[PDB]
Design an enzyme around this catalytic site. Structure first.
Site, PDB file in Angstrom:
ATOM      1  N   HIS A   1       0.791  -1.236   0.000  1.00 52.07           N
ATOM      2  CA  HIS A   1       0.000   0.000   0.000  1.00 52.07           C
ATOM      3  C   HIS A   1       0.823   1.287   0.000  1.00 52.07           C
ATOM      4  CE1 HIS A   1      -3.715  -2.132   0.451  1.00 52.07           C
ATOM      5  NE2 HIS A   1      -3.429  -2.589   1.657  1.00 52.07           N
TER       6      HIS A   1
ATOM      7  N   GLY B   1      -2.156   2.111   5.172  1.00 55.49           N
ATOM      8  CA  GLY B   1      -2.535   0.749   5.520  1.00 55.49           C
ATOM      9  C   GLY B   1      -1.456  -0.069   6.199  1.00 55.49           C
TER      10      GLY B   1
ATOM     11  N   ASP C   1      -3.538 -10.834  -1.799  1.00 54.22           N
ATOM     12  CA  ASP C   1      -4.061 -10.268  -0.559  1.00 54.22           C
ATOM     13  C   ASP C   1      -5.569  -9.996  -0.653  1.00 54.22           C
ATOM     14  OD1 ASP C   1      -4.415  -7.849   1.523  1.00 54.22           O
ATOM     15  OD2 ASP C   1      -2.425  -8.713   1.932  1.00 54.22           O
TER      16      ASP C   1
ATOM     17  N   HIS D   1      -6.894  -7.319   0.118  1.00 54.76           N
ATOM     18  CA  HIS D   1      -6.980  -5.910  -0.262  1.00 54.76           C
ATOM     19  C   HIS D   1      -6.340  -5.641  -1.624  1.00 54.76           C
ATOM     20  CE1 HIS D   1      -7.209  -5.773   4.229  1.00 54.76           C
ATOM     21  NE2 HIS D   1      -8.112  -4.839   3.980  1.00 54.76           N
TER      22      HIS D   1
HETATM   23  O1  LIG Z   1      -3.866  -5.971   5.297  1.00 55.62           O
HETATM   24  C1  LIG Z   1      -4.044  -4.811   4.937  1.00 55.62           C
HETATM   25  N1  LIG Z   1      -3.704  -4.379   3.729  1.00 55.62           N
HETATM   26  O2  LIG Z   1      -3.184  -5.266   2.789  1.00 55.62           O
HETATM   27  C2  LIG Z   1      -4.705  -3.807   5.833  1.00 55.62           C
HETATM   28  C3  LIG Z   1      -4.866  -2.488   5.422  1.00 55.62           C
HETATM   29  C4  LIG Z   1      -5.583  -1.595   6.201  1.00 55.62           C
HETATM   30  C5  LIG Z   1      -6.138  -2.010   7.398  1.00 55.62           C
HETATM   31  C6  LIG Z   1      -5.966  -3.321   7.837  1.00 55.62           C
HETATM   32  C7  LIG Z   1      -6.515  -3.757   9.138  1.00 55.62           C
HETATM   33  C8  LIG Z   1      -6.081  -4.738   9.988  1.00 55.62           C
HETATM   34  N2  LIG Z   1      -6.898  -4.668  11.053  1.00 55.62           N
HETATM   35  C9  LIG Z   1      -6.818  -5.484  12.248  1.00 55.62           C
HETATM   36  S1  LIG Z   1      -7.421  -7.156  11.910  1.00 55.62           S
HETATM   37  C10 LIG Z   1      -9.169  -6.989  12.117  1.00 55.62           C
HETATM   38  C11 LIG Z   1      -9.986  -6.793  11.010  1.00 55.62           C
HETATM   39  C12 LIG Z   1     -11.361  -6.751  11.165  1.00 55.62           C
HETATM   40  C13 LIG Z   1     -11.926  -6.892  12.416  1.00 55.62           C
HETATM   41  C14 LIG Z   1     -11.116  -7.070  13.519  1.00 55.62           C
HETATM   42  C15 LIG Z   1      -9.740  -7.118  13.376  1.00 55.62           C
HETATM   43  N3  LIG Z   1      -7.817  -3.701  10.890  1.00 55.62           N
HETATM   44  N4  LIG Z   1      -7.584  -3.143   9.723  1.00 55.62           N
HETATM   45  C16 LIG Z   1      -5.243  -4.214   7.051  1.00 55.62           C
HETATM   46  K   LIG Z   2      -4.899  -8.482  -3.710  1.00 57.69           K
HETATM   47 ZN   LIG Z   3      -4.564  -7.063   3.351  1.00 60.67          ZN
END
Ligand SMILES: O=C(NO)c1cccc(-c2cn(CSc3ccccc3)nn2)c1
Ligand SMILES: [K+]
Ligand SMILES: [Zn+2]
Ligand SMILES: O=C(NO)c1cccc(-c2cn(CSc3ccccc3)nn2)c1
Ligand SMILES: O=C(NO)c1cccc(-c2cn(CSc3ccccc3)nn2)c1
Ligand SMILES: O=C(NO)c1cccc(-c2cn(CSc3ccccc3)nn2)c1
Ligand SMILES: [K+]
Ligand SMILES: [K+]
Ligand SMILES: [K+]
Ligand SMILES: [K+]
Ligand SMILES: [K+]
Ligand SMILES: [K+]
Ligand SMILES: [K+]
Ligand SMILES: [Zn+2]
Ligand SMILES: [Zn+2]
Ligand SMILES: [Zn+2]
Lengths: 419, 400, 416, 401
Positions: free
Chosen positions: C139, C147, C175, C177
Site C-alpha cells: 500500500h 494501511g 491479498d 486488499h
Molecule cells: O492488510 C491490509 N492491507 O493489505 C490492511 C490495510 C488496512 C487495514 C488493515 C486492518 C487490519 N486490522 C486489524 S485485523 C481486524 C480486522 C477486522 C476486524 C477485527 C480485526 N484492521 N484493519 C489491514
Molecule cells: K490483492
Molecule cells: Zn490485506
C-alpha cells in the site's frame, strides 16, 4: 390510614431467595430514605397459634400433598445429603425444579408472602386501613399443586379468598405485571364473585403462554371463565414496545367500566415492575416519571379515585434499583391520594446504606429516554365491553349503558359500547 | 431418571394440526392408563423471556425470512379473508403449501415441538435425566427455509445443535419409514454429528433421497463431514427379524467407533405392518420381537444419554400401542425396574378407539443387505481414518 | 535452490511494530519446527556501504521529502511533537493507522533490505525462488504511508528485477486488499504487468481496483502503460474452489501472453476464513485444496524465477500455518523433494499459540451458486490482455488461450 | 490544529453527482490557491474493515431497508435497462425520486460524506484537532428511511451521534443554511443532550416547510427533549447586519446555558445575495461584515471543539469564495496566526470560473418580528434549563438582548 407490611424477620425471609436477592430491602429502605415510613401504618405479618392452623390456612387453596412436598423440599436442602431417586420424582411431580428449585429457606420464604398478604387483607376487612401495600407479595403464577415462574405459594389467591369470604361481596383483581396472571385467573375461573383482569405481553413461546386467543375451521376465541364464572375472567394481551401513554389509554376506560358494572367491595392490584423500559426483559417501555406520566402511576391513581378499599402488591421486576424507584413513587402517590397530604420527593436519591446501588446518576427517574395508526386495539375494547355486558346479564346486575357510553365518549369512542 | 415431555398447553397444541389430530392425546393417555406416569419425570417445554430470544433460538437453524413467513401464515389463517395473490406467491416460495398448508395454529403448533425437544436436550445436558422421551417431536423433514412432509420446523436439528454445542459427538438414529433428509442435510458438513437413517426407498417414494444417486453411487457428506452421513434403504415387505438383523450390526459398530456423547433416536411408527402405508411389516410384539423394541433396547444398553422422539405414524391407536411399549422398555432398562403391562387395554378416555379387540398387541399375523453392510463398513473405516479415531478394525468386522 | 530471507537482527526488527507484533517470529519458528530450514538457502538482508547509498536505494521510488520525514519520525519517538512537526507528519499520512514508534524507520527499511536481497539472488541465478515473509507491503505510495505500510519493498524489488539484463515482470497480488501502491507505481510502465484479486465494496479499504463510476469502466493504466494494470474484485464469502477457478485461467493466460522473465507474488493471508476480517473463506487445507496452494503451485509450474512475499494476515497462528505449507510446497515443486508435514504441531517455544487443537489445518468447517459467477470478468480481462499484446507488439497466441479456457468448456469467452 | 477532510478518491466521489457537479473541487482548489493547505492537517475519510462494519455504522441512524434500497439504486443505474415497475415502486417508498434520483455513483457519493464527517468527529474526540472542516459534508435533510432535498444519507446526524457517545456530553448544533435543518432536528427531537438551532427562511410553500409556526405555536421537542429544538425563521431580503444581530444574542445565550462539549456548524452558502435562490442578502465581506464570518468568529471564540460542515450553495465560485474565507478565519482564530488573503483571485486551474472581475469579494452592492422571536427563544431556553436542572444567571443571559 395507609398500611404497609414489614417486620425484621419478614425482611430477612423476603431477602433469602436466590432469584430476588435483596430487592425487598432496597424497596423498603428507599421508602424509608424518602421519609415515607412515618406516614404509614405498619401491618405485621400474620402468625398462627399452631402448625395445624397454619396448614389449614395454606390448604384453603393449595393441596395437602403439595404443601407437604414443599416443606420436605426445605428440610432436604437444610441438610448435606442429596435427594434420592424417589425424592427427585416427587419434587418433579409438583414442578419443584428448574425455575422453582429448592433452597434452604424455600418454605419459610414462600409462607412469608402469604403471612403478609393475609394480614393486609384482614386490616382492610376491619377498616383499620383504607389501602394496604405489601411489596413482599404478589406471586400470581403458583397453582393449587404446582410451583411456577418463581412462585411457590399464591399469596394473592389466599388474600382474595379472605376478602371475598368476609361479610354480595365482590372483588376486582387487576394484574399489571408484564406476564399473564394465570394462577389467580385459574383459581377463580368458576367464581363470578372474583372478577380478574390481566394486561400483559403475549406472543408465541413467551411465558406462561395463556391470556390470549385460543380448532382448524373456526376463528380464534378468548376463553373467559366457565360454569357460573363464565365471562368473569378478562384479558388484554399487547404487543411489545408499548409506551406510558398508549398503555394508559389501553386500560384506563376498561378499569373505569369494570368498576361501574361490577361495583366491587375490594380491589386487589398486582403491580409487577417488569413492564419498565429498563427491565432486562426489555419488552414494554413504561417509566416511573411523574410530571409524560408513568402508566403505572396513572392506573394506580385511577383505581384509588374509586374510594374502594384496596390491596396493592408487588410481583415481577428484575432491575432491582429501578423497581425500588417505581414502587417508592407508587407508595408516595397512595399517601397523597388517600390522606390528601402532599408528598414531595426530591429528584436526588437520599443518603442511605444502598445509595451506591442507584449509580451512575443517583436520581429518582429511571435512566431512559422515551422516543417514537394501525397499532390500535379498538376491537379489543369492543370485545371486552361485550364480555362485561354478558357478565352483567348472567349475574343479574345493572348494566348502566349511559354511564359506560359517556366514559368512552370522552375520547370519541362511545360507538364501541354495547347496549 | 427417565424424563417425558408433557403439559396442558403442550397437549392442546400438539393436538391442533389437521394431519395428526388427537394422536398425541391417545399416546399420552395410554401411557397414563398403564400407570407409567408416576415412574417418569415430567420435563416442561422450554419457554422464553422475549420474542427476540425465541427468534434467536429458532433461527439457529431456520432463516429469519422463513420464520417470518410461517408466523404470517398463522396470522392470515386467523382471519376470514382469503390470501392475496402476493401472499400466495410468498408462501409458495417456502413450500408452505400442499402437504404443509396453513391452519389457525400452524406456528404455535410447530414451535411447541421445538420447545419440547430443546427442554429435553437441556435435561440431558444438566444430567437431570439419563433418557428423555418426547412423543410430540421428531419432525425430521423440515429444511432451513422450506417446509416438507408435514414438517414445518426441525425440532431434531435444534435439539442436536444444543447438544453438540454444550470433544462432543452426537449419533443420530432415524427409524422412520421415510429417509431423514432434513437432519442429514443440516449436518452434511459436520463430522461431530453422525447421522444414520434406515428407511424404504423406491422410485417416486417420498422424499426420494437416502439411496443410490453416469453410474450411481451413495453420497455420504462433504468437506470435513465426508463419510459422516449413513443410509440403509430397504425393499418393501421386511419383517421384524430381517429388519433387526439388517440394522443391529450397523448400530453396534457406529457406537464402538464413534463413541458418542449423546444418542438421538427418531422412532416414527409408520413402519408398523398396520400403518396405512403398508410398506414394512414391523410389530410392537414383546415375547417374534418388535424391530423397534430390539433397536431401542440395544441403544439403551450402551448407557449413553439418549433422546427418544416420535415422528410418523398414521394408525393412531397402533402408534400409541407401540410407543407405550417403548416407554415401558426405557423405564425397565434405565431404572432396572420390572414393568408388567396387561395384555388388555385398560379402561380410559380413549378405550373405544382400541376396538374391537382391545389388546395391546397390534392386530397382525406375521444378498442386497450383505452388500450394503460391506459398503457401510467401508464408509465407517473411511470416517474413522479421516477423523483420526481409534478402533479395532477386526472387532467391528466380526459384528457383521 | 529455494531461498528464504532471515537473520538475527532482521527477526528483531520485523517483530518491533505495534500492529504486527511477533507474527514474523511465529512464522519462521513454525517453518523451523517442521524441519524445513535445512532445505532452504538463507538469503541475508541487503546492507549498504554508506548512508548515501541507502538513501539512493530507497529514493529510487520514494520522494526525498517523504524519506526525510520518516527518518525524523523515528528520531522524535526516540526522545512531544511541535505543532509544525505534527503538520509535517500529517502531510505524509504518518498518523492514524501509520503512526510513529521508536523503530518505525528501521522496521520499514528492513523489509526493503530483505526484498532487495531476494531480487538480487534471483538475478544472479543463485536461487530459482526466494521467499520473504517479512516483506510484501503493497500500500505504500511514493510520498505517503498507507494501511500499515511505510516503505514499498515490493516496488523497489520489482524495479531491481525489471532493470536487470525485453525484460518483463508479472506481479500477482493475492491479498484480501487491492494492491494499490504497486499498481500506481507502474501505471505508466508496460514492462511491469500488475494483477490483483481482492475484495472490493463501498467503504472497504482502500477503495480502488473496481469499477470507476455512461456505464462504469475499469481504469487499466495510462500512456505506454495502457492495458497493463489488471484487477478482479470479488464479493465476500468466496471459498477455495471458486477462488481457484476464478484466478487459475487468468494466471495461465497472463503467463502465455506476457512471457514474464520474473514473477513476484504477494501472498497476504487475510483471505483465510479465520482471519478476523471474516470476508473470504479460504483455507490452508492440503488433501478441497487451499486456494493459496493451488495458485502457488500453478505459478511455480511455469518454471520462471519467482519471488514470494508476505503481507496481510491478522490471525498470527493461522498465518504461520498457511505460510509454512506454502514454504513446504515451494520446496516440493522446485526441488522435486517430498515434504511431509505432520498434522500435529511440533514442539517449539511458540507451541502454546496453536491451541486448543494444536493441529496444522486451520480450525474451520467449510459449508455451502448459479448467479454468483464472473464469466463477464473473464471476458473483460482477456480483452484487456489482447489490447495489451497489440499495443506492445507481442504475439497473441489465440489457439493456446482458447484451449486453456476450453478445458472447462469456456473457450467462447476468449477473444480473437 | 485545524483539520480539513480531503483525499483524491474523496474528491472524485464528491464531484460525481449531477446536482453539485465539480463544486467541491472549486472549493478545495481555491483554498489551495491561497496557500492555506500547509496550515491545515489533512483528515482522511474513514474506511471500514468489512461490509458488515460499514452497514453497522450507517444503520446507527438509517434503516437497514433504506440502505439496501440506496445500494440497489446505484447497482440499477450501473446497467443499461430501465427500472421495472416493482423497482420503481420500491424506490418511491423511500422518496428515491424527484430531487433525489439515482445515478451511477449515488451510494458511493452519499457514503463518502459520511466517511468524511465521521473521521472529522474522531479527530476531535481524540484531540488531534481543535476544529475540523469538511466541505464535502453537511447534508441535513435526509431522514431515517427517506431521501430529501438532494440529501441521501445524513452525515451530520451520524457525526453528532459519534460525538455524544464518546464519554456528561452535550452537543450544540447550529444550522446557518438558507433551509430549515429538519433531518437533524428530527433525529434528536427526544434528546436533551443534542440541542439544535436552525436559522433559515420559511414562508408558505418554501422547502421543506418546517421550522416555523405550527393561536399557532412553535413545536420544540418532545419527551425528555422538550424545549431542546430551537428555530428562527426570517423574512426574505435580510442583510448581513440584521441577520447578525438576529442570531448573535441567541448563540451566546445557548453557549452560556448549554455549556456544550462540542459544537457542530452547518455552513450552507445559499444565503449569499448571489445565490440563484436570491432570498437572503448575506456576503463574504471581511472589512459591512459577512453574517457567516460574524457567526463563525463568535462560535470559535468559545474555545469549544468544533466541526464545520458545508451544505447548500448553488453559485459554485461564490460558495468557494465564502468557504475559503471561513477556512482562513478558522486558522486565524484557532492558531492566532494572521492569514492575509489577496483581494484578487490567484492563478490556478479554475481561475477562469471567477470572471470577469476575478476578485475574492462576491460581486454585490449592498424589527418587531425579531424582538418577538427573541422573547420567545429566551423563554424556551429558560424552560429547557429548568427541565434539565441546569444552573444559569437569568439576568446575565437576558442582558445579551
Ligand atoms: O492488510 C491490509 N492491507 O493489505 C490492511 C490495510 C488496512 C487495514 C488493515 C486492518 C487490519 N486490522 C486489524 S485485523 C481486524 C480486522 C477486522 C476486524 C477485527 C480485526 N484492521 N484493519 C489491514
Ligand atoms: K490483492
Ligand atoms: Zn490485506
Ligand atoms: O416475572 C415473572 N412472572 O410474573 C417471571 C416468570 C418467569 C420467568 C421470569 C424471568 C425473570 N428472568 C430474569 S430477568 C431477565 C429477563 C430477560 C433477560 C435477562 C434477564 N428471566 N425470566 C419472570
Ligand atoms: O411420515 C412422513 N414422513 O416421515 C410422511 C411424509 C410425507 C407424507 C406422509 C403421508 C401420510 N399420509 C397419510 S397415511 C396413508 C398412507 C397410505 C395410504 C393412505 C394413507 N400420506 N402421506 C407421511
Ligand atoms: O439547499 C437545499 N437544502 O438545504 C435545497 C433543498 C431543496 C432544493 C434545493 C434547490 C436547489 N435548486 C437549484 S438553485 C436555484 C434556485 C432558485 C432558482 C434557480 C436555481 N432549486 N432548489 C436546495
Ligand atoms: K399482568
Ligand atoms: K372469575
Ligand atoms: K428413517
Ligand atoms: K454429518
Ligand atoms: K503497469
Ligand atoms: K438553517
Ligand atoms: K434535541
Ligand atoms: Zn412478571
Ligand atoms: Zn414417515
Ligand atoms: Zn439549503
Amino acid at each position: 390510614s395507609v398500611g404497609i407490611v414489614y417486620g425484621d424477620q419478614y425482611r430477612q425471609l423476603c431477602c433469602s431467595s436466590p432469584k430476588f436477592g435483596d430487592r425487598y430491602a432496597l424497596v423498603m429502605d428507599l421508602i424509608n430514605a424518602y421519609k415515607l415510613i412515618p406516614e404509614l401504618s405498619r401491618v405485621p405479618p400474620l402468625q398462627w397459634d399452631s402448625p395445624s392452623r397454619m396448614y389449614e390456612a395454606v390448604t384453603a387453596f393449595h393441596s395437602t400433598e403439595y404443601v407437604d412436598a414443599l416443606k420436605k423440599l426445605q428440610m432436604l436442602h437444610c441438610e448435606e445429603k442429596e435427594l434420592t431417586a424417589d425424592d427427585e420424582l416427587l419434587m418433579d411431580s409438583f414442578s419443584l425444579n428448574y425455575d422453582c428449585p429448592g433452597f434452604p429457606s424455600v418454605f419459610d420464604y414462600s409462607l412469608a408472602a402469604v403471612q403478609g398478604s393475609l394480614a393486609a387483607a384482614s386490616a382492610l376487612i376491619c377498616r383499620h386501613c383504607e389501602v394496604v401495600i405489601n411489596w413482599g407479595g404478589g406471586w400470581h403464577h403458583a397453582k393449587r399443586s404446582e410451583a411456577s415462574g418463581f412462585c411457590y405459594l399464591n399469596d394473592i389467591v389466599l388474600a382474595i379468598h379472605r376478602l371475598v369470604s368476609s361479610t354480595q361481596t365482590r372483588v376486582l383483581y387487576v394484574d399489571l405485571d408484564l406476564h399473564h396472571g394465570d394462577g389467580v385467573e385459574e383459581a377463580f375461573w368458576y367464581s363470578p364473585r372474583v372478577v380478574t383482569f390481566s394486561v400483559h405481553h403475549a406472543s408465541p413461546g413467551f411465558f406462561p403462554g395463556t391470556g390470549t386467543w385460543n380448532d382448524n375451521d373456526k376463528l380464534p376465541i378468548f376463553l373467559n371463565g366457565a360454569g357460573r364464572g363464565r365471562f368473569s375472567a378478562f384479558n388484554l394481551p399487547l404487543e411489545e414496545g408499548i409506551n406510558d401513554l398508549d398503555w394508559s389509554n389501553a386500560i384506563g376506560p376498561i378499569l373505569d367500566s369494570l368498576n361501574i358494572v361490577i361495583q366491587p367491595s375490594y380491589v386487589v392490584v398486582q403491580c409487577g415492575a417488569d413492564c419498565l423500559a429498563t427491565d432486562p426483559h426489555r419488552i414494554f417501555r413504561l417509566t416511573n416519571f411523574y410530571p409524560s406520566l408513568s402508566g403505572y402511576l396513572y392506573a394506580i391513581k385511577k383505581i384509588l379515585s374509586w374510594k374502594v378499599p384496596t390491596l396493592i402488591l408487588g410481583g415481577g421486576g428484575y432491575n432491582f434499583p429501578d423497581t425500588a424507584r417505581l414502587w417508592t413513587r407508587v407508595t408516595a402517590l397512595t399517601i397523597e391520594e388517600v390522606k390528601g397530604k402532599k408528598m414531595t420527593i426530591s429528584p436526588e436519591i437520599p443518603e442511605h446504606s444502598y445509595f451506591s446501588r442507584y449509580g451512575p446518576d443517583f436520581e429518582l427517574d429511571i435512566d431512559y429516554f422515551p422516543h417514537e395508526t394501525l397499532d390500535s386495539i379498538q376491537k379489543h375494547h369492543r370485545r371486552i365491553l361485550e364480555q362485561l355486558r354478558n357478565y352483567a346479564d348472567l349475574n343479574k346486575l345493572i348494566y348502566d349503558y349511559d354511564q359506560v357510553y359517556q366514559l368512552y365518549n370522552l375520547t370519541g369512542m362511545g360507538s364501541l359500547v354495547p347496549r
